[PDB]
Amino acid sequence: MALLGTILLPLLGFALLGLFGKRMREPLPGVLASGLVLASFLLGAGLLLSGGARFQAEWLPGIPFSLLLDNLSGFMLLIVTGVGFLIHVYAIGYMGGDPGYSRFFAYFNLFIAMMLTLVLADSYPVMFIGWEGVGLASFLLIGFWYKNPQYADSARKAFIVNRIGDLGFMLGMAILWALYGTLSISELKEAMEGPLKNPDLLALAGLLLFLGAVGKSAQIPLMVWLPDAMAGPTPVSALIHAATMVTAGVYLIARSSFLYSVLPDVSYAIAVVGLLTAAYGALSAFGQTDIKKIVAYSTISQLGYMFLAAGVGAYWVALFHVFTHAFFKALLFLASGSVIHALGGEQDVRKMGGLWKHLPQTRWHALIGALALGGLPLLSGFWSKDAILAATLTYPFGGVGFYVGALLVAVLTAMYAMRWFVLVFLGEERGHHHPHEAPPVMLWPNHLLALGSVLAGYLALPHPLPNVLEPFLKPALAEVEAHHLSLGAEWGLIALSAAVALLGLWAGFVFFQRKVFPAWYLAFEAASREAFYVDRAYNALIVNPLKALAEALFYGDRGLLSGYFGLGGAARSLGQGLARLQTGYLRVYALLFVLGALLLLGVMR
Amino acid sequence: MVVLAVLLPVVFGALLLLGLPRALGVLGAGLSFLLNLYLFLTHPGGVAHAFQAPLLPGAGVYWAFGLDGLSALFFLTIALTVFLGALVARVEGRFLGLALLMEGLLLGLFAARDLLVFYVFFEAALIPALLMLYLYGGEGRTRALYTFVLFTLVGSLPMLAAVLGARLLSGSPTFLLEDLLAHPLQEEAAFWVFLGFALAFAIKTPLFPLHAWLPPFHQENHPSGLADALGTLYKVGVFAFFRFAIPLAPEGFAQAQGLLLFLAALSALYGAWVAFAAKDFKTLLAYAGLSHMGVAALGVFSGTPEGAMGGLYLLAASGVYTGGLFLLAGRLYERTGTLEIGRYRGLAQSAPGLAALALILFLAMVGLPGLSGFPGEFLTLLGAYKASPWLAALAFLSVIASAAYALTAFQKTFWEEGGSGVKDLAGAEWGFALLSVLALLLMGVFPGYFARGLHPLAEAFAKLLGG
Numbered sequence A: 001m002a003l004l005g006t007i008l009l010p011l012l013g014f015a016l017l018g019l020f021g022k023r024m025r026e027p028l029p030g031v032l033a034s035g036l037v038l039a040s041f042l043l044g045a046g047l048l049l050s051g052g053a054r055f056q057a058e059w060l061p062g063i064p065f066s067l068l069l070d071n072l073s074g075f076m077l078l079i080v081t082g083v084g085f086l087i088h089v090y091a092i093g094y095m096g097g098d099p100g101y102s103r104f105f106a107y108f109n110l111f112i113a114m115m116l117t118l119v120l121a122d123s124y125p126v127m128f129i130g131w132e133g134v135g136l137a138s139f140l141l142i143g144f145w146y147k148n149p150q151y152a153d154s155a156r157k158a159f160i161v162n163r164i165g166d167l168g169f170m171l172g173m174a175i176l177w178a179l180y181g182t183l184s185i186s187e188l189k190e191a192m193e194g195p196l197k198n199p200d201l202l203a204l205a206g207l208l209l210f211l212g213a214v215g216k217s218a219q220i221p222l223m224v225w226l227p228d229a230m231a232g233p234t235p236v237s238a239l240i241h242a243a244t245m246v247t248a249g250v251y252l253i254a255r256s257s258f259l260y261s262v263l264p265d266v267s268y269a270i271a272v273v274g275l276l277t278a279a280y281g282a283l284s285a286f287g288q289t290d291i292k293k294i295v296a297y298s299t300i301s302q303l304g305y306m307f308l309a310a311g312v313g314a315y316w317v318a319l320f321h322v323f324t325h326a327f328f329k330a331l332l333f334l335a336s337g338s339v340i341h342a343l344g345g346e347q348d349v350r351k352m353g354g355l356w357k358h359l360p361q362t363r364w365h366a367l368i369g370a371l372a373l374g375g376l377p378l379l380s381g382f383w384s385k386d387a388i389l390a391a392t393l394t395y396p397f398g399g400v401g402f403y404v405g406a407l408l409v410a411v412l413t414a415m416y417a418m419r420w421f422v423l424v425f426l427g428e429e430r431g432h433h434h435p436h437e438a439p440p441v442m443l444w445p446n447h448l449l450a451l452g453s454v455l456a457g458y459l460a461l462p463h464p465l466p467n468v469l470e471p472f473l474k475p476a477l478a479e480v481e482a483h484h485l486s487l488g489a490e491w492g493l494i495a496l497s498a499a500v501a502l503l504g505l506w507a508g509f510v511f512f513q514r515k516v517f518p519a520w521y522l523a524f525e526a527a528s529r530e531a532f533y534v535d536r537a538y539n540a541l542i543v544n545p546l547k548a549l550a551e552a553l554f555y556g557d558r559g560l561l562s563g564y565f566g567l568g569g570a571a572r573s574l575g576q577g578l579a580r581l582q583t584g585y586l587r588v589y590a591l592l593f594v595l596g597a598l599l600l601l602g603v604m605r
Numbered sequence B: 001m002v003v004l005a006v007l008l009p010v011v012f013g014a015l016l017l018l019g020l021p022r023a024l025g026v027l028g029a030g031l032s033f034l035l036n037l038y039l040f041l042t043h044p045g046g047v048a049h050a051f052q053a054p055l056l057p058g059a060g061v062y063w064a065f066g067l068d069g070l071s072a073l074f075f076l077t078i079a080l081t082v083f084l085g086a087l088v089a090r091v092e093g094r095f096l097g098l099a100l101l102m103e104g105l106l107l108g109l110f111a112a113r114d115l116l117v118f119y120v121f122f123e124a125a126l127i128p129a130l131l132m133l134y135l136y137g138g139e140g141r142t143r144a145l146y147t148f149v150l151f152t153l154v155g156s157l158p159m160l161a162a163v164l165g166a167r168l169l170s171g172s173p174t175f176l177l178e179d180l181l182a183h184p185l186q187e188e189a190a191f192w193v194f195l196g197f198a199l200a201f202a203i204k205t206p207l208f209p210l211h212a213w214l215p216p217f218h219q220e221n222h223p224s225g226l227a228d229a230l231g232t233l234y235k236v237g238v239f240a241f242f243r244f245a246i247p248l249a250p251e252g253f254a255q256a257q258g259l260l261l262f263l264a265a266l267s268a269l270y271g272a273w274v275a276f277a278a279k280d281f282k283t284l285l286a287y288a289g290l291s292h293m294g295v296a297a298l299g300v301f302s303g304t305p306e307g308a309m310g311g312l313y314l315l316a317a318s319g320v321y322t323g324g325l326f327l328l329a330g331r332l333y334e335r336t337g338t339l340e341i342g343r344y345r346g347l348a349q350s351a352p353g354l355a356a357l358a359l360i361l362f363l364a365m366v367g368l369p370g371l372s373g374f375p376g377e378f379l380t381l382l383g384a385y386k387a388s389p390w391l392a393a394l395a396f397l398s399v400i401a402s403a404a405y406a407l408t409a410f411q412k413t414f415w416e417e418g419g420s421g422v423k424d425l426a427g428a429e430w431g432f433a434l435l436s437v438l439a440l441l442l443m444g445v446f447p448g449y450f451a452r453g454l455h456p457l458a459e460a461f462a463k464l465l466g467g
């Protein structure tokens, strides 16, 4: 019941801003929102500290309503509600003088409540309330300033492309019901102890579940929806890209670890898609000429890293990275939000540069952040990245092919991060803005993130060094694994991660300060800005043909009705043919008569 | 008890037709609503409030009524939907009496405990349906009407051949459902009887090639679309299958079942797919209804207690939000003047949380969990996959199309650039919103309570298809 409290608080709260909301002055909705998130984080962390929590109740027969709060759930709850809280308090600042304060924070509480319903769920359908709910709240928020045609289609694409994966979720969900008949993650895990059954079919279910995950965490092929999610206010992008949404993509794999750990075939594909998403996202990352999109592609890529982690059987690691990332991505986005709250939403890069002096404290934010993403050897993103890279080699499913790839991507990530920082804060100036106006409630929570960024790192250090994130996560879920490691070899790897990271960062610092970009940085700034021409290809035989087929089948249906009318006219024709039999001539009547008599007589005897 | 609840809209409607005014009939829809709701929260089991009276005995025809778990749920659904239509209205050419008349006719239709009386109501309800189509709106009133009427009746009258055969070939004493079931037909008799039920029920479901009456019908009714809501409550086909066509001639249902699952599936996908192209709320909602019924019929046709319960539930709950979307389309029509989606773009900010009401409804329609559509859609998926996984998938290449049409229409009708402006929300429209969303949220959040009575009927009429 109290567990359900954590969910109901940002809903009992949400409803007030929709029902009333405009009835209030304009520091308030943010205060209520952030207050309920405050006492959701808090009064759910009390539960976590109390050892955990449960809820089971009335729903459709055979499919009960269950919330489980364990370690794996508590971790997500703290990430979501905490980082979410900070982003709320920031949003109190960045959203100001904007009508729809109530709309914004109602949608925010809605979002939080949905995400909590997602993570706190012991049955896949309740989790599905979570998924569709969060997608819906994303839709509402991406198209927040609705008076814009672009910032509507953005959200449309969100709640459609996402629903493509949601369909897979449903399908696999049904397979794991025809098969087992429980549909509750706990008893679905306990029934998957043993020999399993129809492993091919089980693989199918897990594969559709994964194809579900793809949309929500914006992996390929459903990658395409996320860059367009930039439309909504900046802190919305922060929540979607860091603390919520895409996190569920990984989290679903982590809960369903009992299912994927027994699937050699599928996990391989999961890791491969993870790496492909990472590489793609990273290559098309830096070509972006917008501060927003260029970070969105880092979201896509990094989540690719996570799916590569969870792919190879290292489930606790993917969440470590999810955590660090939850900090430094929120940091990055909120930083950019402050930056364009300072430039009046200029939101460009080549039209920017040299904000180093004029912007106090923001430069440090974006530097700590961009370096954490780059993987500065004594920062979070570093430890998570080397954790993943080593987990590649050490775990089942090979990882030797993957490792080198993830390393190249590890270079490229540093490169585009430094492109971002340089292009934003360095190299002369363009435009006009005066004093500061990077206010308390914007830089204050943004400060706290930068701390969390640096110190997220050592919660899980390599083997001999104290690791507290593994013994917390593993008991809750994902227990089965086979990992061989060697001391000093692994440190050769960690040192390689550090060296290559520093190297990449350093290269990026000069390369994207350069001002001369020869031959194929034209041939790269084109493709990469256009995401390697992927959307243009998705509207090739995927979208527009279907869009056309709607009309095609419409007019077809019109033709069907038309044909029925044709039957009508057939009866009309036959009818006026039978009525044409009566000429009015009596001799004719006599002929038809005698004929008829002969007919009836002919039938009987 | 039952006959009181069946007759109450009929008399109030009759008192309305001649007598007038509206309000006395609106509180009539309210009285029927409260009575039916009270009836939902009371009954223990299948029999409920039985009724048996002689009608033609010697023919075997009796006035027989009663509330299954199913009948109760539909009495609630219908009473609610029609009531919402009543207090919102803006039709009120005093044919809200015709509306209540059709309500009572449908209530009798679902309470009908014997075949011939069921038939009686099935066809009798056609009368208001055709009237409020003729004399209350539409340029193409006449073609929509003769199409709708001729379709349902060309399906219907040959069913009479089957309803007779159901009793005659089985040697059943009367037309009572119980007796008819106590006397099974043999093969190639059960075949024919099931077929004769099946054309009339598929065409009134509607299934794919037999749905062509649906778009003209929904266009040419009064632009408010009360008659459209009630037309959607007259979509009793799936229910008719489940209660009647299938149990009375299962041997034939077995042969037809593959084809039926097929038609249901592609009806869902097709409906939702061409629903995109619709350039007016009437056509859009119509094809959307075709999709939903596709899903429901898929649920029933599967066997599978899950799927059947899901399908019936989906029908029930979709009555409310489909009727509601129709009524709302009428309410923005009244303030704008057209059911064209494109013209008069941005309405939100001019209108209050009317955007919220419309969006809640659209989300219920696309079947967002927590709203009425999802529970039924989901149990249906569960059962369909059991029956034929491939058609479950084909049919469920739907949710994509649903989000497509619903969100496209919603965006182009509400979200975009500000127009002239509008009214906010009427004192009636507020009752509408409140009661509606209350309903959607309750049936979506507690699909436990509703459909408890669906459970025994589901598994029993599933085992019917077993040994």
Ligand SMILES: CCCCCCCCCCCO[C@@H]1O[C@H](CO)[C@@H](O[C@H]2O[C@H](CO)[C@@H](O)[C@H](O)[C@H]2O)[C@H](O)[C@H]1O
Pocket (backbone or CB within 6 Å): A015, A017, A018, A019, A020, A021, A022, A099, A100, A101, A102, A103, A106, B348, B349, B352, B353, B354, B355, B356
């Ligand atoms: C059990 C009780 C039921 C509780 C559930 C009720 C929740 C309803 C809220 C749904 C969305 O509500 C949303 O917020 C308001 C409410 O009028 C609307 O917003 C309108 O008023 C706000 C108030 O700040 C204005 O800023 C804004 O410019 C305007 O668009 C908006 O149209 C709607 O989309």
